[PDB]
Each structure stands twice: as structure tokens, then as C-alpha cells.
């Protein structure tokens, strides 16, 4: 009864806000240069991944648990959500990321705060190289999300939340060495806003993840497992007036 | 057939006593300053999470496997358990934590004993900051618990025990840096009793987790996925006389 | 058609032999003092656990996947298997552990070989203190096994293999500091035969685990979730003549 | 309508190529000597394993998700796939490994490139010893794979993808110390071609993994769980003309 005007839509947008707040808080907080014991690569990798896995499990049934502007955009291109759901989700994700980083800023002691765990290019490498890396990291993540959340799947699914979570961990085990690992425009945007700190190569953390995810969406939803759908039904999905 | 008098209820209370004993024993025992090899952050975090994850799987069918007064009180507020089940569970949890911490004291060598892994603030974290952190830590946990044990769930659940387990691990990966990570007033209370060691900040490890869990319950059960029910049925739940 | 004469029984005894060989090989192999990169506590605990988890998944459907004399004896006392099945399994497990430890001895370089990762009591720990620890370590494991493999379970079980595996990992995260972590008489026995090195505290690695596992069986099968059966039926299980 | 010619087959070959590309990229990428933070044993092992778990979850429904010439050949021997499928999968796997290694070479900084994480025999290990290790490592993996993907299984399977994945992690926790851990001829071939360097022991990374997986297939499909097909049916599978 009008997609945008429903209580379900209000709960979904709020859930996207809340999930991204919690994600960023946990992600950045585990990555700070704590004097007591500097976090290791695997430590940070599992922290980010377990945050997504926990949040996917907890708030996934409310909104779909995107928690990531690149994932949301790819689902739009692959014809899975409406334009307006995409807009509100992305908006909620960026606001959530800012809040999460802001809350972290207010609780972290001064010796730990540092750069608030912003993404940083590895200066032994170039923009183009780093962007290719982020394209790959987000590509495998996206592909795993689409495969784990496809209601058509007949292969035993296991735990979608834990599979998706551990894909985030995988991305970090390589990506940290290149860019601090983004895979998520909101993860990069949040702390950059709170610390008023945008590096020249900030575009990498938007273009890489988005292109990676969208490529996975094209591959998955259009080449590997296409669906039925008339053109008018495809237009209806974009508008949010599709009756299945 | 009169809740408090049933064999089921007796087993439930025993299981909450036993689960907290084993949890606290393993948790604290993994976190001591073993001179042979000092436990790392990730190592401690996984021990706490796998303990909860193993105990959820093993004893959860008996009692619901709360293993945590903050969670028990949250489920009361959310109208899921009776007042008497709450009192007995909390009592069983506190006594169990003391038993586990006591058993550890009796087995651990002198060079490893230390302060028996009591909770303690970072020397640069204030009580106010610690408070907000514990709230967030227990909030994500409670939310993951309620989502993973909801009978109404249609989303593939995966493993609720391991999801809840890894959500605890998630908590520790940030929490240890602030308060040694509590998320659980019984976990804080057990070693504090055995060592007769209550820091001024001890209240944080009670209020922080309880408020965090209660907010998650209010959100989950009254805002996101309400049950409705008549006000006489709600009262019947509190008094232990509700029939489905 | 006669238990010991069935093809299924032969496959089962072989499976227990093979699983224990592979388990002990991976277990000990991961724990050698490799000079290029000394294995960390978490490294070893995960290896042991992932070994059991992988072998439960792969060979459990053939034999039950005990891979542990303590578990087998516990299932005998809990009236789940026959006496003759118990005898052959233990035999196969002990022989398997010698094979695995022997094979590792054959491939490992001497700069890493050391004691072939035999169990050893911590200097600062009495035999009796190690006794209580080994009891508890094996107790939580057995309890998790019985809960995860119970065909009466209505609770989402998730992955019994991974849950059981991670329980082994949990055991090592504390137990390594006390005894190198046994939980398994065959695991202690294997390298001790190959190295011809039996420590004074060797009985601990038998009594601790066996007592811990048996207590868990009594608790689970006779107190928490019993099955009321006639005396003659119980005797029929022991003799291997029972028909459900 | 002729196996090789179908749309499904074309996708399956591509999926194997893409899976091996991504696998090798992440695997080698996680293993480079990054001077800022040298990857730990457990760090590398989880990267490799989680790569397989993620790719098995994502692309397994498309191809069977072999990502490994040893597994593919084992499945041919075990009468599970056609000769033509085995040929194209192996070919696609090897081309994918080169592509993945090639892409890493293009993005990795000079200070971390090193040997591009080619497998390398331990100086203190003989070729014959490394041979036995690789046999055992791939044996346990193949066994886990066949048990987890058997549609005749009644025991709860849990997460096939993650069980297989963590089996790979298990392989590495022992294998890295001997050979850098191969378990997969493509994984060894890829960077060897790109770097134009083949070790004297390179055959071990082929023969070891292939023998181990084939033995596992003979044990699983002909000794433990046979299917009793007629000889004409077996020949039909080999030719890809089998109808169930
Ligand atoms: C690092 C450790 C990773 C541990 C991964 C645990 C894998 C989880 C894992 O193994 O989950 C397996 C799920 C599969 O679902 P199902 O069909 O068995 O249950 C019915 C199902 N449709 C439902 O109702 O949800 O098991 C649920 O209990």
C-alpha cells in the first residue's frame, strides 16, 4: 500500500541506519592503535567480518541487511530493489556511518583515537592498483551475498550471515595491506566526515567497491542466474509497484 | 503444572547454574597472564565466544541458555519470561559465576593467578565512556540473541549458538580495550567476589550491560517484531500462568 | 544380522582407526616447535578443533565419529552403544593414534620434532589440579557432543561437526597451559608410545578425560534427557541385540 | 543435448576459471612478505580456507565448485563426472591460476612481491617426505568434500561451504611448514608460470595432491558408500550421456 509510506519501509530504513552505526563503531574501534596492545591483521579482519555476520543475522530480516552503499547500488542495477529503497538505504547508511564514527570519537581515549581508523592508501602502491584491488574484494563479497540470499537456491545454504561475514574477513586479510580495506563507501565516508579528513585518493573507496559490486550483480542476476520478468515488471520493480 | 514446582523448572535453574560456572571458568582461565605465553586479544575473545557458543548448543535446550543476568532481565522486560524464572535464573547465574571463578582459583598456578581476570577500566577510559561502550556491546549481543531464537523467524537461521557465540567474540574484540569486556554482570561479579576485589567502576559492569540488553529488548519485542497479546495474557506471562 | 559380523561394523571400526590417525597427525603436527614460526596458542587450538570438525563431517556418518576413548566409554555408560562396539572402537582409536604419531615422526624434521608434542604437566601444577582441569575440559566437550547428535533435538542444531570442533578448540584455549590439553586418552597415548616417553602424570590423561566424559553422559542421558526403557532392553543394547 | 554444447556447461567452465582466479589472487596475496606486518601462519591459513568457503558458497551451484585439478580428477576416478568435464575444468583451473597470479603481480608493490608465494620445499624436508604430507593434506580435504556434497546424506550437513573451507585452513596449519602447502596443483602452477620459476620439487605439488584425492575418492565412492550402477551406466557417466 505505497512502498515508501509503509511501516515496513520505515523499519527497514531505520535498520539500515542502525546496522551501519553499529558496524562502523565496531569496525573502527577494533582497528585503533591501542597502546595496550596493537591490533593484528587477523584481529581486525575478524572484527569487521563478525560485525557484518552478527548484524546480518540480527537486522537482516528487517531490511535485507545491506549495510553498504555499493551492495545496495548493485541490487538496484540487478533489478532487485526500487530506486527509492536504494536512495533511502544509501542515505541511512551514510548517516549511520557518521553517527557510528562520531560515537566512537566520543568514547575512545586520546592515545587510541589517532586518525579514527580512516582508509589510507599504501604509498608503496598506486591509485589504479588499489582500485583494482577494491574492485576484486567487493566483487567476491557481492557474489557471496547474492548467492546466499537467492530464494531459488537448492544447494544447502548453511548460514548466510556467517558466510557473508567471513567473506568480509577474507577481503580484509588482503585489502588491509592496500587501502586499509574499504569494500564499503560508508565505512570510508563516516570517519572521514567526523575527522574532517579526505585523502586525495578517497575516490578509490567509492569507485572500486561500487564497480566491483555492480559487476558481480550483472554477472549473477543477468548472465549466470537470470530471472523471468517482462519489461513492464522490471519497470514496476524500479518504481516499487511490482506484485509478485 | 505450577511453574516453580515442575521438574523442568528445576533442570532449567541447574543448567543456568552449570552454564555460568563453566563459562566463567573458561573465560577467566583463558585470560590470565600465563607466563609461558601471554594470551592475545583475539585468543581471549574467541575463548569467551566459543564458551558461550558451546554452552548455548549444549544447555540451551534445557533453560534457554541465558548464562547472563543482563539477558535474563531483558527477556523479562520484553515480556518473554516470568518474574520468578528471572529471579531464580539471576540467582543461579551469580552463584554459578562464583563457583567457576572459585574452581579456577583452586587449580591455577600462583604465577598465573594474578587478579583472576576481573574486569578493569583502561587507565585513560572514564566511567562515563566505559558505560556507553558496555551498553553498545551488550546491545548488539542481546539483539543477535533475540533474532536468533525467535520462533517466528522465516529467514534461514544457520547456527544460532555459533552466531551468538561469535557475537560475544565481537564484543571482546573492542570491549577488552575499554573494560576488559563485561557484557555480563555475572562475569564481572564472580571473580570480584572470589578475589574480594571491587574497583570503584564496578557499577559500570552492572548498569552498562543491563541497560544495553533492556534497550535491545524494547526495540526487538515492542518496536520491530511485536506480539500484541491481551493485557491479561501479558500479566499471565509475568506471573507464570500463561498458556499458548 | 549380528553386530560384529556386519559390513557396517567393519567400516565403522576402520573409520575410527582412520579418523584418529588423521586427527593425531594434524593435532601434533601443528604443535611442534617449528623454529621458523613457533605455533601460537590459538593456532594450535584451532588446528585440533578444525581437525575434529572436519573428521566428524567426513567420517561421523560411518561410525558416529568418536575418535576418543573417553567419548566411547561415556556412550557405553550412557547406554547408547554395545560393549563390543566400545571395545573395538577404543582398540582402533589407540592403534590409530600410534599410526598418526608414527607417521608424523616419519615426515617431521628434527629441528621441529622435539618431544612429538606429548602431553606434559606444567611444573607449577600438581597432578590433582590437572585432574580437575582435564575432567572439566572433557566434560563440556562430551556434553556438546551428546546434545548435537541427539535425534530427539527440536532446537536448530546448525552444524554438529563445527560446534563439536570448536568445543575442542575451546578446551585447548585453557587446557594447553595446564597439561598441553588432552581431553583424549588416545591423543596422549599415541605420541607416548612412539617416543617411548611416559611421564609420571600419564594416568591423569586417562582418568581426567574418562571421568569427565562419563559424568557428562550420566547427567545428559540419565538426569536431563533420559529414555525410559525396560531392564531387558538396556541389557540388549549392551549385548548388541537391541532392535528399536 | 550433448554435454559440452549446453549453456549450463559453458557457465560451469567459466565459473571454475573465475573461482580459481579469485582463489589464487586472495591466497597468494595474503601470503606475501608484507614488511609492515608479516602475515602469520594462522593469518595465511584462514585467508586460503575462507577463500574456498566463500567461492564454494558463491560459485559452487554453477559448476560443483572444484577450484582444484586434484579434486576434479578424483571425481572422475570416482565415476562422478564425465571425461570432457574433467578436461575443461582442469584447463580452466590452470588458466585461472595463471590469471590470478598475473593480476596480483600487477598490483603488488615491489617490497612485498618476493617470489609471489610460490610453493617451496623446506630445506630440512626430503621430496618423499613432502610427498606423503601433501597426500595426507589433500586426502582429508577430498574426503570432507565428498561427504559434504553427497546428496544421499541424512546426517545434518550444516554448512558444506564452510566445512570444506575450514578443511583447507586445517591443511595449511600443518602444510605451510613443509611445502608452503599446495593441496592444489593449480595453486602451485599459477605463480610458477608467472614468475617463470619451477622448483626441483614441483612434481610433488602435482603427484602428492592428486594421489591423496584419488585415494580418498576410491575409499569414499567404492569402499564406504558405493552406488551399485551397472557397467553401461558407468561408461555413460564417463561419456556424459548418463540419464537419471
Ligand atoms: C568460524 C566458524 C563458522 C561456523 C559456521 C556455522 C555454520 C552454520 C550451519 O551449519 O547452519 C546449517 C543450517 C542449515 O539449515 P537446515 O536446513 O539444517 O535447517 C532449517 C533451515 N532452513 C532453517 O530453518 O533455518 O542448520 C540449521 O540448524
Torsion of CA B20, B25, B27, B31, to 10 degrees: 160
Q: Is D162's CB within 8 Å of C158's CB?
A: no
Residue B243: burial class (beta carbons within 10 Å; 0-12, 13-18, 19+): exposed
D43 near D30, Cβ under 8 Å?
A: yes
List C-alpha distances in Å: B106 to B47, B103, C121, C133, C187. 20, 5, 16, 10, 26
Q: Which three cell numbers stand for residue D139?
A: 586426502
Q: Which residues of B165-192 are buried (b: 16+ CB within 10 A; e: fewer)?
A: bbbbbbbbbbbbbbbbbbbbbbbbbbbb
B4 near B240, Cβ under 8 Å?
A: yes
D158 Cα–ligand 1 center, Å: 5
Alpha helices in chain C (DSSP H): 7-31, 41-63, 69-77, 83-107, 110-113, 127-148, 160-179, 185-194, 204-217, 231-239
Task: State the DSSP code for C38.
Answer: P
How far apart, in whole angstroms, are the C-alpha atoms of residue D175 and residue D52?
16
Q: Which three cell numbers stand for residue A16?
A: 539500515
List C-alpha distances in Å: C192 to C25, C70, C105, C187, C232. 14, 17, 12, 9, 41
Atom of ligand 1 nearest to the CA of C156: 28
Task: State the DSSP code for C184.
Answer: -
Residue that has been written with the C-alpha cell 573492542 in this structure: B174
B163 near B148, Cβ under 8 Å?
A: yes
Indicate which residue's Cα is closest to atom 28 of ligand 1. Answer: C158
For B61, which of C124, C153, C177 is closest by C-beta distance?
C153
C80 near C233, Cβ under 8 Å?
A: no
DSSP D98-150: HHHHHHHHHHS-HHHHTT-S-----TTS-HHHHHHHHHHHHHHHHHHHHHHT-
How far apart, in whole angstroms, are the C-alpha atoms of residue D180 and residue D162?
22
A49 Cα–ligand 1 center, Å: 18
C177 near B112, Cβ under 8 Å?
A: yes
B66 Cα–ligand 1 center, Å: 21
DSSP A98-117: HHHHHHHHHHS-HHHHTTTT
Which residue numbers of A have CB closer than 8 Å to D's CBs?
Answer: 40-42, 45, 122, 124-125, 129-130, 132-133, 136, 139-140, 143-144, 146-148, 153-156, 158-159, 162-163, 166-167, 169-170, 173-174, 177-178, 223-224
Experimental method: X-ray
For D173, which of C30, C58, C110 is closest by C-beta distance?
C30
For residue A187, give the nearest of A130, A117, A105, A110 by alpha carbon.
Answer: A117
A56 near A65, Cβ under 8 Å?
A: yes
Enumerate the residues of chain B whose CB falls inside 8 A of the CB of residue A17.
Answer: none
For D30, which of A144, A166, A173 is closest by C-beta distance?
A173
The domain that holds D91 is classified in CATH as: 1.20.1080.10
How far apart, in whole angstroms, are the C-alpha atoms of residue B55 and residue B53?
6
How far apart, in whole angstroms, are the C-alpha atoms of residue B20 and residue B9?
17
**Domain region containing B60:** 1-244
How far apart, in whole angstroms, are the C-alpha atoms of residue C46 and residue B160?
21
Q: Which residues does a 6 A CB cutoff place in the pocket of ligand 1?
A: A 158-159, 162; B 156-159, 162; C 156-159, 162; D 156, 158-159, 162
SS3 content of chain A, % helix, strand, coil (to 5): 70, 0, 30
Helix D69-77 vs helix D127-148: crossing angle, to nearest 10: 70
Q: In a mutational test of the pocket of ligand 1, which residue from C56, C60, C159, C164 has the highest number of ligand atoms less than 8 Å from its CB? A: C159
List C-alpha distances in Å: D56 to A221, A232, C40, D160, D188. 18, 35, 29, 8, 20
Q: How many domains does chain B have?
A: 1
Residue B103: burial class (beta carbons within 10 Å; 0-12, 13-18, 19+): buried
Q: Which residues contact C203 (CB under 8 A, 6 or more apart)?
A: none
Task: State the DSSP code for C203.
Answer: G
How far apart, in whole angstroms, are the C-alpha atoms of residue A3 and residue B217?
27
List C-alpha distances in Å: D133 to A235, C102, C238, D180, D208. 57, 13, 40, 11, 8
Q: Which residues contact B228 (CB under 8 A, 6 or more apart)?
A: none
**C53 to chain D: closest CA residue:** D163
Measured on CA atoms in the order A121, A125, A126, A131, is the torsion positive or negative? negative
How far apart, in whole angstroms, are the C-alpha atoms of residue D22 and residue D35?
24
Residue that has been written with the C-alpha cell 584451532 in this structure: C46
How far apart, in whole angstroms, are the C-alpha atoms of residue C51 and residue C47?
6
Atom of ligand 1 nearest to the CA of A162: 5
C50 near D163, Cβ under 8 Å?
A: no
Q: Which residues contact A167 (CB under 8 A, 6 or more apart)?
A: A49, A140, A141, A144, A145, D50, D54
How far apart, in whole angstroms, are the C-alpha atoms of residue B80 and residue B60?
15
List C-alpha distances in Å: B72 to C121, C203, C224, D112. 39, 42, 22, 51
Q: Which residues contact C206 (CB under 8 A, 6 or more apart)?
A: C185, C188
How far apart, in whole angstroms, are the C-alpha atoms of residue A62 and residue A57?
10
Nominal resolution in Å? 2.6
For residue B71, give the nearest of B243, B212, B224 by alpha carbon.
Answer: B212
Task: State the DSSP code for C34.
Answer: -
How far apart, in whole angstroms, are the C-alpha atoms of residue B92 and residue B21?
9
DSSP C45-95: HHHHHHHHHHHHHHHHHHH----SHHHHHHHHHTTSS-HHHHHHHHHHHHH
Q: Is B58's CB within 8 Å of C125's CB?
A: no
Task: State the DSSP code for B196.
Answer: T
How crowded is residue A151: how many other Cβ atoms within 10 Å of its Cβ? 5
List C-alpha distances in Å: B15 to B69, B148, B239, C71. 14, 20, 22, 21
Enumerate the residues of chain B whose CB falls inside 8 A of the CB of residue A60.
Answer: 155
Q: Which three cell numbers stand for residue B2?
A: 505450577
How far apart, in whole angstroms, are the C-alpha atoms of residue C152 and residue B219?
34
Amino acid at each position: 500500500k505505497k512502498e515508501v509510506c509503509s511501516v515496513a519501509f520505515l523499519k527497514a530504513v531505520f535498520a539500515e541506519f542502525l546496522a551501519t552505526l553499529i558496524f562502523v563503531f565496531f569496525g573502527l574501534g577494533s582497528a585503533l592503535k591501542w597502546p595496550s596492545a596493537l591490533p593484528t591483521i587477523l584481529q581486525i579482519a575478524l572484527a569487521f567480518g563478525l560485525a557484518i555476520g552478527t548484524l546480518a543475522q540480527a537486522l537482516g530480516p528487517v531490511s535485507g541487511g545491506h549495510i553498504n552503499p555499493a551492495i545496495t547500488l548493485a541490487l538496484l542495477v540487478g533489478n532487485q530493489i526500487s530506486l527509492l529503497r536504494a536512495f533511502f538505504y544509501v542515505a541511512a547508511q551514510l548517516v549511520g556511518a557518521i553517527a557510528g564514527a562520531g560515537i566512537l570519537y566520543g568514547v575512545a581515549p586520546l592515545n587510541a583515537r589517532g586518525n579514527l581508523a580512516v582508509n589510507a592508501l599504501n604509498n608503496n602502491t598506486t591509485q589504479g592498483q588499489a582500485m583494482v584491488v577494491e574492485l576484486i574484494l567487493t566483487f567476491q563479497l557481492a557474489l557471496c551475498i547474492f548467492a546466499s540470499t537467492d530464494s531459488r537456491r537448492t544447494e544447502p545454504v548453511g548460514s548466510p550471515a556467517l558466510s557473508i561475514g567471513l567473506s568480509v574477513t577474507l577481503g580484509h586479510l588482503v585489502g588491509i595491506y592496500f587501502t586499509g580495506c574499504s569494500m564499503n563507501p560508508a565505512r570510508s565516508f563516516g570517519p572521514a566526515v567526523v575527522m574532517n579528513r579526505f585523502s586525495p585518493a578517497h575516490w578509490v573507496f567509492w569507485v572500486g567497491p561500487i564497480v566491483g559490486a555492480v559487476l558481480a550483480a550483472i554477472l549473477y542476476f543477468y548472465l549466470l542466474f537470470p530471472n523471468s520478468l517482462s519489461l513492464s515488471e522490471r519497470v514496476a520493480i524500479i518504481k516499487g509497484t511490482y506484485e509478485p
